[PDB]
Design a protein around this ligand. Structure first.
Ligand SMILES: *[C@@H]1O[C@H](CO)[C@@H](O[C@@H]2O[C@H](CO)[C@@H](O[C@@H]3O[C@H](CO[C@H]4O[C@H](CO)[C@@H](O)[C@H](O)[C@@H]4O)[C@@H](O)[C@H](O[C@H]4O[C@H](CO)[C@@H](O)[C@H](O)[C@@H]4O)[C@@H]3O)[C@H](O)[C@H]2NC(C)=O)[C@H](O)[C@H]1NC(C)=O
Ligand SMILES: *[C@@H]1O[C@H](CO)[C@@H](O[C@@H]2O[C@H](CO)[C@@H](O[C@@H]3O[C@H](CO[C@H]4O[C@H](CO)[C@@H](O)[C@H](O)[C@@H]4O)[C@@H](O)[C@H](O[C@H]4O[C@H](CO)[C@@H](O)[C@H](O)[C@@H]4O)[C@@H]3O)[C@H](O)[C@H]2NC(C)=O)[C@H](O)[C@H]1NC(C)=O
Ligand SMILES: *[C@@H]1O[C@H](CO)[C@@H](O)[C@H](O)[C@H]1NC(C)=O
Ligand SMILES: *[C@@H]1O[C@H](CO)[C@@H](O)[C@H](O)[C@H]1NC(C)=O
Ligand SMILES: *[C@@H]1O[C@H](CO)[C@@H](O)[C@H](O)[C@H]1NC(C)=O
Ligand SMILES: *[C@@H]1O[C@H](CO)[C@@H](O)[C@H](O)[C@H]1NC(C)=O
Ligand SMILES: *[C@@H]1O[C@H](CO)[C@@H](O)[C@H](O)[C@H]1NC(C)=O
Ligand SMILES: *[C@@H]1O[C@H](CO)[C@@H](O)[C@H](O)[C@H]1NC(C)=O
Ligand SMILES: *[C@@H]1O[C@H](CO)[C@@H](O)[C@H](O)[C@H]1NC(C)=O
Ligand SMILES: *[C@@H]1O[C@H](CO)[C@@H](O)[C@H](O)[C@H]1NC(C)=O
Ligand SMILES: [Ca+2]
Ligand SMILES: [Ca+2]
Lengths: 445, 443
């Protein structure tokens, strides 16, 4: 009567077993209304229950830090802390993964404040460590050893999305984004809930306990708790009227009208004012604008704000790409055109013009026809015979864009050598530098 | 009481109803015995039912053709047809996929019967046609213009596996493998059941109805009906003693003992005898051994035949590749070593040595460790600086591993010069061919 295996059946049909061939079945179904607040103000995600029929809403853990001193913790709490040693951003209170740590090193690279090194982001996962450190205009990644942009190894991926260098762990769902002036840490609540620590605080959905010391007790003065998260290192062992600029008024302006809802602008406006007061006229005051716009874009609300700032800070990327305030997070590459489960959250950055498109990940030349591109960034077309390197090559469409078979030429000598000191001179041929000639040529002796 | 969907429940449960809660649960589960024998004699594959109740055994439609005249239909009927124009292997009686046809072309790649150029096949799927031709030891493919080996476009893929160049349609399940002396067409039964037509016959699991003329007909001489399928197009529009050598005896030898079961060897032995009789002393008899071994490997009994052929039929590829008779169909390749999961039945063919491995698809350099390889087929190491195409280049792991930056050649100019007739000379730098420093040569 009670079933031989009153028992939860497949497809959520818990059944009350009257008998083996007749039962008293019950449907299971659960619809929760969207979680009202998440305390960070970002929209909740529906995370499914272990039973497929039911589901729930959980808050994403989002930490953001812009400019030099400013940071918002996983639960929205905003605080300004300045320091020099590498400070830990997030770790795991009860270690699940082998090494998981996103660590910031602000000015530890250099005491002076410049794009040479505002800060460097170190994401350490298991055996790997990724060190994104902005050397002037372009950050370069050092992995344990420099690497390229679309890196992928041991479940850790690194890629450039818009103006943000993204280090992600799909198995953990961890997305870390580094910009010149801003850093973001996004963690699933289910995987890292009430299990995180550091300057980004504890993801518990209440702002009250988002300031835990390495010891683990919390404090009210959240700014002081941040210094206690120092990551000790052998180097630097000690590791010890303002005018409201009109630019700062852009936060409260009608441009960000859609942003004033679903995202609180008070913190960013205060950060802008404080940065303007820190020293005027150093173009550091428009870092808060960038992150306010980025968070608005995260809320599926894309804005163009930079042309409104009357200059004084724009993007610095080469001429073959144009700045777009609203664009795909993953630009459409010809080689890798695919589903890509587009988030369609439109990010800002600079992309290839409308007519052309990017060739492939890891490349930067924009092309019209898809073609093939060689180590030198030059568009080739399918079927084009050319002579790259010193070898004749073809650009067929297939597994390898360029066959590049070896050139068919050689040095040309003279056997007769009938003149005083006629010697085979291997002078480089102007048409083919490698295909030179070694003809017999009279020398003085 | 009437169930508000008496119903087939989830996970193939079933029920009838007395109340929606009070239901009369059933369960449907079963395991039919294997299809004992299919006309092809290949092991039938496990084809799932639309629901989750049970499954069944459906044999794959396998058509093989080796040598010049020899064919075996989708149902194990062997025949020998000689032709000079392009012919249709398999089409659809009722067209369900647009322009889907596999067409053979004999005596047009070259009129040649030996491995250098036996024939060409043209696989047409929708907007695409793949023309695999083989010129001497190297088969080349033309797609609509030539293409590379790991070609992929519009759901149609071409690669090479072992000695066989594979054109497949994963959506349709169609597989087509050309080696110079053989081809094989594999079609799933459910997708192409009694809908096929051509020289490969109808896939009905019965040999009897295999032979049809273009117009629906049943003629018992499959050989004679093969001529009727001729596809004519603007190309070539005018288109219309024997010593029993031991080499063929190798089929019946104890080497193929595992093959004599699960695979009938009568057809291949007769084909070898006939090929020897057509003209002896030309090694056209090693095509039947090759395909017998290929079929055995399909059925898991992989054997080496070439070694005991006493030097008659051997494979060829450059020195960096060694012949391993039972090796992976998908080569372990460093780029995309993702534990590529494929049928673990090992194919014959030549691979990189056990110490090294193939670098990436479309490449041929057997890298030891891993690295980048340039357009020039030179192995590179991670974090290595070289000078290629007159640009400083670094091989570093990531995307587009070779990152090459322009020369940046700082020629320092020798210009104030004193000697008889010393003129400023921007001669090409001996140290760097790319640099042409001013060195100020005299007369
Ligand atoms: C962590 O958890 C989640 C996010 O993960 C968040 O909590 C959920 O939402 C609220 C937080 O505000 C929790 O508490 C409830 O708040 C309601 C507020 O409603 C007021 O405002 C609306 C505006 O329209 C008015 O209409 C309304 O009249 C109120 O003025 C309260 O109304 C709720 O009270 C009811 O529910 C509780 C709990 O069942 C009952 O005890 C009450 O008697 C009454 O029926 C309630 O106080 C809510 O509980 C959380 N939901 C879930 C599913 O957990 C938070 O960010 C965070 N921390 C908290 C506080 O949980
Ligand atoms: C397509 O693929 C199918 C499945 O593999 C094959 O069709 C069957 O496969 C058998 C196996 O060879 C074929 O041969 C004969 O099967 C008879 C089955 O009869 C029993 O099973 C059926 C139900 O399936 C019952 O109704 C019946 O009462 C029996 O219990 C056998 O009886 C035959 O035996 C005779 O021939 C063999 C040699 O082949 C002798 O050794 C025996 O002594 C006896 O004389 C025989 O085995 C047959 O075509 C199909 N039968 C089945 C099992 O369904 C086809 O081979 C394949 N291609 C074709 C042509 O359809
Ligand atoms: C889990 O989170 C709650 C707050 O939501 C906290 O009070 C509790 O101590 C946490 N426990 C763990 C497992 O850390
Ligand atoms: C210039 O500014 C306007 C808003 O005032 C904006 O709509 C436009 O896209 C900007 N163009 C640029 C970026 O030059
Ligand atoms: C993303 O957009 C592309 C077109 O740009 C489309 O082909 C692809 O299917 C989309 N993927 C998803 C699921 O967003
Ligand atoms: C300059 O260098 C190129 C490349 O090596 C060579 O072909 C050419 O002859 C040299 N001379 C000049 C000045 O053109
Ligand atoms: C050209 O000169 C090089 C040396 O720079 C020599 O190795 C080569 O054999 C010569 N012949 C060719 C290829 O023209
Ligand atoms: C296939 O065979 C079935 C009978 O099993 C028949 O009804 C159907 O019409 C046949 N289809 C073709 C086109 O051969
Ligand atoms: C190699 O050849 C000899 C003669 O063919 C034979 O005895 C031996 O079994 C062969 N070994 C294999 C299978 O490689
Ligand atoms: C394809 O099959 C081979 C044969 O064992 C097996 O190694 C693996 O499944 C595939 N090869 C690789 C490593 O890609
Ligand atoms: Ca918290
Ligand atoms: Ca048939």
């Amino acid at each position: 009567p009670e079933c031989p295996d009153t028992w939860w059946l497949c497809d959520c049909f818990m059944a009350t077993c009257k008998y083996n061939n007749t039962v008293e079945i019950v449907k299971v179904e659960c619809e929760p209304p969207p979680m009202p607040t998440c305390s960070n103000g970002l929209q909740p995600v529906r995370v499914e229950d272990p039973d497929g029929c039911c589901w729930h809403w959980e808050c994403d853990c989002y930490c953001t830090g812009w400019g030099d001193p400013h940071y918002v913790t996983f639960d929205g709490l905003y605080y300004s802390y300045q320091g020099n040693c590498t400070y830990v951003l997030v770790e795991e209170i009860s270690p699940s993964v082998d090494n998981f740590g996103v660590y910031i090193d602000n000015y530890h690279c250099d005491p002076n404040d410049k794009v040479s090194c505002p800060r460097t982001l170190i994401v350490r996962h298991e055996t790997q460590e990724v060190l994104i450190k902005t050397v002037h205009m372009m950050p370069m990644q050092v992995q344990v050893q420099a690497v390229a942009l679309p890196y992928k190894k041991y479940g850790l991926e690194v890629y450039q999305s818009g103006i943000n260098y993204v280090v992600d762990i799909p198995e953990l769902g961890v997305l870390v984004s580094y910009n010149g002036l801003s850093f973001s840490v996004r963690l699933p609540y289910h995987r890292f809930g009430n299990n995180t620590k550091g300057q980004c605080g504890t993801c518990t959905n209440t702002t009250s306990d988002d300031c835990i010391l390495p010891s683990g007790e919390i404090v009210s003065n959240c700014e002081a708790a941040a210094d206690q998260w120092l990551v000790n290192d052998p180097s630097k062992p000690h590791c010890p009227d303002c005018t409201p600029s009109p630019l700062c008024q852009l936060i409260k302006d009608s441009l960000f009208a859609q942003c004033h809802a679903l995202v609180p602008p008070q913190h960013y406006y205060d950060a802008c004012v404080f940065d303007s007061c820190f020293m005027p006229g150093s173009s550091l005051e428009c870092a808060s604008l960038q992150a306010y716009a980025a968070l608005c874009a995260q809320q599926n609300i894309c804005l163009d704000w930079r042309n409104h700032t009357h200059g004084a800070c724009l993007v610095e990327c080469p001429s073959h790409r144009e700045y777009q305030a609203c664009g795909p997070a993953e630009e459409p590459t010809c080689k890798s055109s695919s589903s890509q489960q587009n988030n369609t959250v439109l990010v800002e950055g600079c992309f290839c013009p409308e007519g052309t498109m990017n060739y492939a990940p890891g490349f930067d030349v924009c092309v019209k026809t898809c073609g093939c591109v060689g180590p030198d960034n030059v568009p080739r077309e399918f079927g084009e015979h050319f002579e790259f390197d010193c070898k004749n090559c073809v650009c067929l469409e297939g597994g390898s864009g360029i066959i590049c078979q070896p050139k068919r030429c050689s040095q040309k000598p003279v056997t007769h050598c009938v003149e005083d000191g006629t010697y085979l001179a291997t002078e480089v041929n102007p048409a083919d530098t490698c295909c030179n000639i070694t003809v017999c040529k009279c020398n003085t002796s």
